[PDB]
Amino acid sequence: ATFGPVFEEQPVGLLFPEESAEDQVTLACRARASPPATYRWKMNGTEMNLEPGSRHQLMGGNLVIMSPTKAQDAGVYQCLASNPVGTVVSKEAVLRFGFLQEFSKEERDPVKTHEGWGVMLPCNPPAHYPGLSYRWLLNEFPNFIPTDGRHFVSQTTGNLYIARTNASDLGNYSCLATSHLDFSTKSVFSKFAQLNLAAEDPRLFAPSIKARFPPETYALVGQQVTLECFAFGNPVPRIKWRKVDGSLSPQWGTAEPTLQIPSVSFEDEGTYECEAENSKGRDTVQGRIIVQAQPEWLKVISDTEADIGSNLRWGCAAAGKPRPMVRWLRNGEPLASQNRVEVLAGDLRFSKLNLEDSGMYQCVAENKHGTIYASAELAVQALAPDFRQNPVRRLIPAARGGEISIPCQPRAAPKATILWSKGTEILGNSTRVTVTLDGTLIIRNISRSDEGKYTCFAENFMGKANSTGILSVRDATKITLAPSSADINVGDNLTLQCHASHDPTMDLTFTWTLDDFPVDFDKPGGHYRRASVKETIGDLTILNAQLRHGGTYTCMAQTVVDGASKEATVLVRG
Amino acid sequence: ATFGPVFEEQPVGLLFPEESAEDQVTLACRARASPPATYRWKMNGTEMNLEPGSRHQLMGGNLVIMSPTKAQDAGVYQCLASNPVGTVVSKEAVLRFGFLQEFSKEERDPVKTHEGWGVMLPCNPPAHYPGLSYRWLLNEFPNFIPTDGRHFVSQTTGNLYIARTNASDLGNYSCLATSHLDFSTKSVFSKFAQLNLAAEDPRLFAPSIKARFPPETYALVGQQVTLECFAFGNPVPRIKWRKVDGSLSPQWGTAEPTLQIPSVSFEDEGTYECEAENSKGRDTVQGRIIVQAQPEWLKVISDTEADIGSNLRWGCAAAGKPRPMVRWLRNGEPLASQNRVEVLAGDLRFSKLNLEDSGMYQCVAENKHGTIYASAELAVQALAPDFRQNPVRRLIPAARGGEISIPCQPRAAPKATILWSKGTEILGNSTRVTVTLDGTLIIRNISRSDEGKYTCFAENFMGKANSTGILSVRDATKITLAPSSADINVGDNLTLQCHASHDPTMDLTFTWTLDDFPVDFDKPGGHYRRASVKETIGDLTILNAQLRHGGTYTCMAQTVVDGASKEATVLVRG
């Protein structure tokens, strides 16, 4: 019960915190294999030395990296479970390192404007992977900006937009990035910039958008998307969201600068418009949400057994907005269209399979948004010659000068080459002997010099087999004195003789038939008699012959392995 | 030209910031030594195996640790400068690593009490070296606890004390530590615990202090100290700070739970009391601020050369509030009171120094607040006798029948064994001649038969030396006729005679003094006369004697190498 490796647990991307919770990362990998599978690991498309005492160690099937490093172990990892049958690759798992550096200590320039205008204070946050929440601080660290409708902190660029510079906005402002997500609370603030306010300018301002959203925003199904839109206007501009020829949703307020779509569906695709309006004017900005999707299987291959030289068509299909391109792998290696097998994107056609094509195959569909794998095992079924059924027959009795037919019926996956040999001597097509196509051995005019062992030898790709039989030449049961025809009247007696000879070792049985009817000489009220049976001679006496006791009589002198026969014609008539 | 090692640059403790600028730390160490010194390094009291390609590199004695690690290189470091003369230890420099891990992800159990009572919510902050600033959050992260006087966050344990559990205090509370140091804005908060509020208890509560300060708070002059004091009392307890018997300072508010002494002086030492008072009662807590100080030298040892078998008293003294305990080190190893040398706290007495005692010595004074070192070199001097610096009296005039003392004081490591020889014959303690203990040769009742060469032979461990001097005693200057006293009237003349004898080879000079005043016989308008000087006789004539021309006259007849003297008393009368 040997089979190829089947993945049970596969790797999973991991975000490794920098603050050192543990000094080890364990990427999982595990496979069912009759002969336990050996696991190899490939980072960034290159083998990893997992020998003992190395940093990149192995525990069962799981890859353990000690003291993970963002500069050394960040990137892709792949598991290859292999065994005598073949090799299979697992999902690609990304090891990413989350962190949050601190703000550059370089002093931040101050910003100065007339009171009553709008202004922007930039955050310019430091390098960070997992994601940030941007807030702003006034003067001292504990104190926070008054969060209202006149202020808005962009949570993509971190900047701070003030629609109307108020007299109370004269002070110092710093940025604060907080990486708060599922795991991690690290938070860092920046050097304080300063906001200077000149004389007031009560002059009314038509709304002008300064926090815009991208013209093209690509997101995947199930993901969340957020659009930002904020403007400067002396009356706090009211922000409205709409969809170009779209009903939108009633539950969403759609009144704040941030439009939030959780679990973006494909229907949420399309053009969106933001409008910032105030008593003195209005401004607008538009942009498209272009929904995309990762690959997902539709049809895939399955473990299959196929006879040698068969035709096998395998197909894998996948769905995804960027049309997933499909590829094939044999034992974890690129499978190009070989001589025996044709490869065309999603179809793999084996024409006249061979024993070499068996093994582990995989179809892999990828787009710019990722990759997916599906594996299966191909078993081409061979078979050595087997004589378990239809044997050659241990004993072959014959008769002097008779014909003999000895069958040979091996069963082998590819057609078995057959040969016949008597003792140690091979046999061919002679005048007397014939080795037919089907395999039967034909011997003609047999003599006692042919007695012996005859063996059939069968072979093929896989193996060889042989079977023997004994050949025993006996005397032929023969009729020495045969009865001829006769003509007789009704009421008169007739005698048909049959003088035969046979091998003494065997008993002899005489039979008399009449137009294929068994002459019942023991019939109630019959009209026949079998003469005194000596082992050589047999006679049939018809007493009180009648018109119905005539026809083609047949004498048949048989032994338990041989028989001879003669025919006579009896005509009654008066 | 060879001398012991003298430290010029010494190591310095270092706080390695989290996410430093570079991944290398250079602990300085350098020593002046005529034959360049070898530098050894000791981490946590264990030798360090350094090399170029190793992590622990060396550059001019300075220790460079690449990619510093808190788990591998945190702790004490010491430099040992060694050379043929000896070994010396450097200051202890601590390499510490500042950081701030995040709170344990395990959810923290809720705390429950009766409404109107006081309560404490523990922070249990994560591992951290540098000081932290603890605040608390209510429900969500942006929102902060209202700091008003009913709440108090201990900035030593991080806990949160609520004096009166108010109906509005029912909610979720988390701790937030901010690790603000030289460069760091890191801030991490904990998973939210929950506060459960039972039925109200309107009964007033007598104040009970729960956030106390230690009875003994140890601090150094110039440092800052902070005392915390907060209590539970149903009426918001008023907190007052005072000193049991000190005028204290007006600038300090003494109204908040935290009493702050920046730059604590020695006068700020003493007992302090905090008083929490409310309508229904009062409670107090007392404790002493005990000002202390680090060790600082007062007297220390110095580089010394000492002759073999000398007595050497060394002393090192130090000042510090915990009296610094003094120890000694020989070539960087503990110097216990051995057989030859006595050690008593701050004093080290070498008795009969030997060639083995040379080397580098150090005195090390330590108290609970640190350690201080002072080094010096001890050179024990061997030396053969040398007379180049103090040769023997090359010329020795004396007087017939007089006593002669000829010193012999060579410069030798151990005192030189001395012998005296005239010509080729050695001298001992005879009736006239004696070879004294100090080494001086004493000759008595000398005659012209002793004139000749006298040589001192000195020896010691190392070598032998000798030096000669001529002895030329020719005759004793003697007074044959001495003047006696006299009594005279004013206006009359007096004559004081002095008849002397001298060796013919030398001239003779007469001197007349009057009560240690040189009788000026060439005085403008004087009243003296020195008679006609013959080489044998000298007379002083006082003409027109006066009350001021009397007293103890002294005749002094001298040659340039010998002299005799006599004294008379002249009494004038009016």
Ligand SMILES: *[C@@H]1O[C@H](CO)[C@@H](O[C@@H]2O[C@H](CO)[C@@H](O[C@@H]3O[C@H](CO[C@H]4O[C@H](CO)[C@@H](O)[C@H](O)[C@@H]4O)[C@@H](O)[C@H](O[C@H]4O[C@H](CO)[C@@H](O)[C@H](O)[C@@H]4O[C@H]4O[C@H](CO)[C@@H](O)[C@H](O)[C@@H]4O)[C@@H]3O)[C@H](O)[C@H]2NC(C)=O)[C@H](O)[C@H]1NC(C)=O
């Ligand atoms: C106390 O009593 C002692 C005992 O008498 C007396 O010491 C004697 O000092 C004199 C010099 O003042 C020594 O005379 C020297 O003798 C050596 C040879 O003697 C040595 O070798 C023999 C074997 O050959 C040994 O048996 C013996 O013990 C000695 O070890 C001479 O070589 C010396 O000559 C040098 O100085 C001359 C100038 O006067 C040079 O012209 C001459 O070239 C020699 O100089 C060499 O060395 C120089 C470097 O130092 C180099 O620059 C030159 O170019 C040259 O190569 C010298 O005549 C006598 O040996 C000592 N006695 C003993 C027993 O050793 C002390 O003088 C006396 N104390 C006082 C105060 O006088």
Ligand SMILES: *[C@@H]1O[C@H](CO)[C@@H](O[C@@H]2O[C@H](CO)[C@@H](O[C@@H]3O[C@H](CO[C@H]4O[C@H](CO)[C@@H](O)[C@H](O)[C@@H]4O)[C@@H](O)[C@H](O[C@H]4O[C@H](CO)[C@@H](O)[C@H](O)[C@@H]4O)[C@@H]3O)[C@H](O)[C@H]2NC(C)=O)[C@H](O)[C@H]1NC(C)=O
């Ligand atoms: C016709 O078909 C029959 C039945 O299949 C064959 O009989 C078998 O033949 C094979 C191969 O000759 C035999 O296997 C061989 O056994 C040798 C030892 O023989 C002893 O042990 C067996 C039991 O294992 C006894 O039956 C036998 O009487 C002996 O006591 C091994 O030495 C052989 O290995 C050697 O040769 C092979 C290559 O053949 C090498 O790879 C090896 O390294 C080694 O050098 C081999 O294992 C088998 O034992 C036979 N049957 C039985 C029941 O034993 C006939 O051979 C076949 N005839 C023809 C002409 O095709």
Ligand SMILES: *[C@@H]1O[C@H](CO)[C@@H](O[C@@H]2O[C@H](CO)[C@@H](O[C@@H]3O[C@H](CO)[C@@H](O)[C@H](O[C@H]4O[C@H](CO)[C@@H](O)[C@H](O)[C@@H]4O)[C@@H]3O)[C@H](O)[C@H]2NC(C)=O)[C@H](O)[C@H]1NC(C)=O
């Ligand atoms: C294994 O494969 C992963 C994935 O490809 C790989 O991680 C990648 O490393 C490169 C280079 O370090 C990263 O490229 C960066 O891209 C950002 C913008 O996205 C740039 O700001 C970065 O700038 C660096 O490089 C510049 C070019 O010289 C420098 O001027 C600059 O100062 C920075 O040093 C950099 O170009 C890429 O983002 C990652 N991708 C992922 C998914 O991690 C990893 O490095 C590979 N393994 C090894 C050992 O290299």
Ligand SMILES: *[C@@H]1O[C@H](CO)[C@@H](O[C@@H]2O[C@H](CO)[C@@H](O[C@@H]3O[C@H](CO)[C@@H](O)[C@H](O[C@H]4O[C@H](CO)[C@@H](O)[C@H](O)[C@@H]4O)[C@@H]3O)[C@H](O)[C@H]2NC(C)=O)[C@H](O)[C@H]1NC(C)=O
């Ligand atoms: C050189 O010697 C110094 C001095 O011993 C040594 O530093 C010491 O390390 C131990 C263990 O790291 C410290 O023991 C700590 O005690 C405090 C109590 O104040 C505990 O809170 C600490 O708990 C933390 O560390 C544990 C590790 O044992 C963690 O399991 C735990 O979760 C906490 O994170 C800890 O037990 C000891 O205080 C210091 N001593 C000094 C003076 O700092 C240093 O490690 C040595 N260096 C080398 C390279 O050997």
Ligand SMILES: *[C@@H]1O[C@H](CO)[C@@H](O[C@@H]2O[C@H](CO)[C@@H](O[C@@H]3O[C@H](CO)[C@@H](O)[C@H](O)[C@@H]3O)[C@H](O)[C@H]2NC(C)=O)[C@H](O)[C@H]1NC(C)=O
């Ligand atoms: C040894 O002699 C025997 C007997 O002649 C040979 O068997 C014969 O082989 C031929 C060659 O293929 C067969 O011809 C075929 O006949 C079938 C119909 O049976 C026909 O459909 C084919 O197109 C082809 O013509 C012939 O049938 C067969 N004899 C019998 C009785 O079946 C054998 O080939 C000889 N061996 C060698 C090695 O020469």
Ligand SMILES: *[C@@H]1O[C@H](CO)[C@@H](O[C@@H]2O[C@H](CO)[C@@H](O[C@@H]3O[C@H](CO)[C@@H](O)[C@H](O)[C@@H]3O)[C@H](O)[C@H]2NC(C)=O)[C@H](O)[C@H]1NC(C)=O
């Ligand atoms: C403070 O912490 C407590 C937990 O200690 C928070 O209570 C939790 O509140 C959420 C909703 O805000 C509850 O979720 C609810 O779950 C029930 C099923 O259990 C479901 O029917 C509701 O639709 C909702 O999803 C959660 O169960 C609850 N936890 C417990 C243990 O009761 C609380 O929200 C936090 N904030 C406060 C109190 O302001």
Ligand SMILES: *[C@@H]1O[C@H](CO)[C@@H](O[C@@H]2O[C@H](CO)[C@@H](O)[C@H](O)[C@H]2NC(C)=O)[C@H](O)[C@H]1NC(C)=O
């Ligand atoms: C905002 O930052 C400025 C400096 O950029 C602070 O101005 C300093 O104010 C102190 C008074 O506490 C003066 O001693 C300094 O000379 C000022 N420096 C400069 C460059 O002007 C200002 O105080 C900060 N904001 C607030 C509210 O204090």
Ligand SMILES: *[C@@H]1O[C@H](CO)[C@@H](O)[C@H](O)[C@H]1NC(C)=O
């Ligand atoms: C803004 O300016 C107005 C001026 O009328 C003032 O009343 C108000 O207190 C200031 N602060 C805020 C937060 O609006």
Ligand SMILES: *[C@@H]1O[C@H](CO)[C@@H](O)[C@H](O)[C@H]1NC(C)=O
């Ligand atoms: C049969 O074989 C024998 C011996 O080979 C031969 O004498 C005889 O004539 C043969 N008979 C026929 C019918 O071929």
Ligand SMILES: *[C@@H]1O[C@H](CO)[C@@H](O)[C@H](O)[C@H]1NC(C)=O
């Ligand atoms: C036939 O047998 C019967 C039996 O008795 C006999 O009567 C008759 O004569 C026989 N006929 C011939 C022709 O043998």
Ligand SMILES: *[C@@H]1O[C@H](CO)[C@@H](O)[C@H](O)[C@H]1NC(C)=O
């Ligand atoms: C505390 O409780 C009192 C009475 O229940 C209430 O008046 C007061 O506002 C509360 N404190 C707050 C809400 O900060």
Ligand SMILES: *[C@@H]1O[C@H](CO)[C@@H](O)[C@H](O)[C@H]1NC(C)=O
């Ligand atoms: C007498 O001379 C001997 C020999 O030099 C010396 O050892 C001894 O000390 C001398 N005694 C005195 C009293 O000087």
Ligand SMILES: *[C@@H]1O[C@H](CO)[C@@H](O)[C@H](O)[C@H]1NC(C)=O
């Ligand atoms: C000194 O020595 C001389 C000669 O031996 C002798 O005549 C005289 O008496 C001695 N005087 C003294 C005081 O020793």
